[PDB]
């Protein structure tokens with residue numbers, strides 16, 4: 001890399017790893033559109049396997065950005081609309097609280113208080129129907145944001161119904177393949193297991209458990225190289241050859257709702273650039289129910305935004321942030337779930353210096 005980039009990344013990440021006791025980490029900086037890669041520590045402590053550019057990390061909720069984009073792609077294909085009622089794609093959702101809950105509400109955590117987690121006890125798919133049928137909104141649709149896997153997870157399952165593809169097939173063929181994300185997986189194939197890092201919770205090696213709507217909400221694993229490429233695509237959607245994908249990206253970065261300084265996209269979340277670092281840093285701390293202001297009609301993707309997403313599993317912590325107008329981005333993948341504000345802080349420190 002250029003020395004400027006080498007120096008800011010290292011002087012920022014090294015202390016962070018030390019402070020947080022992160023066993024392994026990979027970082028990519030997109031600078032004037034090109035990727036620069038850094039790796040530290042261990043993919044697998046027991047087997048002494050280092051983190052490389054081919055190491056797979058659990059993205060956790062950064063998976064939601066893929067889901068938003070696949071969702072946006074289905075829109076641009078004319079297969080679904082965000083203004084459609086949920087019942088249009090799940091007619092079995094006959095319970096009366098569902099009247100007026102749209103795909104928009106599902107994708108943006110504004111349905112009326114769908115819970116953060118689908119319960120563990122929901123194994124079968126009729127258990128799932130029961131869960132949504134029996135769910136009681138705390139609020140009218142489109143009035144409060146409460147971040148929820150059961151909300152965007154559902155949007156992801158429904159968005160791919162008209163295609164007739166499974167979520168995974170749809171994701172692989174419509175998002176992963178066109179973008180050349182050849183080491184990105186909903187389900188890690190046995191061929192790639194050698195590269196699958198372990199996560200670490202309280203010093204114990206852990207992989208993400210199977211659960212309802214996992215793939216749609218928190219189930220993607222990826223390498224720093226593919227993740228960099230994800231940032232490049234989202235930075236420059238209009239260089240993407242596939243028409244509906246290109247628009248899908250643009251749709252995921254539209255501003256549908258505003259809470260405080262932040263705007264809710266599809267998966268992605270957005271602030272006006274330049275940004276107050278304390279507004280993103282403290283903003284990122286991990287139930288926070290917030291009133292939302294509808295942006296009528298949604299603002300198309302603003303190039304002068306800080307576009308970002310945090311993501312966690314029991315054993316992993318990820319962060320992606322990019323600034324379209326600066327052609328600037330960062331991916332940070334760690335095999336420990338460490339505080340969000342530390343991530344955002346490291347990321348702002350790096351990006352601010354290169355801007």
Ligand SMILES: O=C(O)c1c[nH]c(-c2ccccc2)n1
Nearest residue numbers: 161162163164165166169170
């Ligand atoms: O193997 C295939 O080509 C395949 C997999 N799924 C489909 C498909 C499913 C629903 C509607 C259209 C095609 N084709």
Ligand SMILES: O=C(O)c1c[nH]c(-c2ccccc2)n1
Nearest residue numbers: 053054182183191192195223
């Ligand atoms: O033909 C090749 O060189 C080729 C295609 N894919 C790979 C590859 C497979 C797994 C991990 C990394 C590269 N090599």
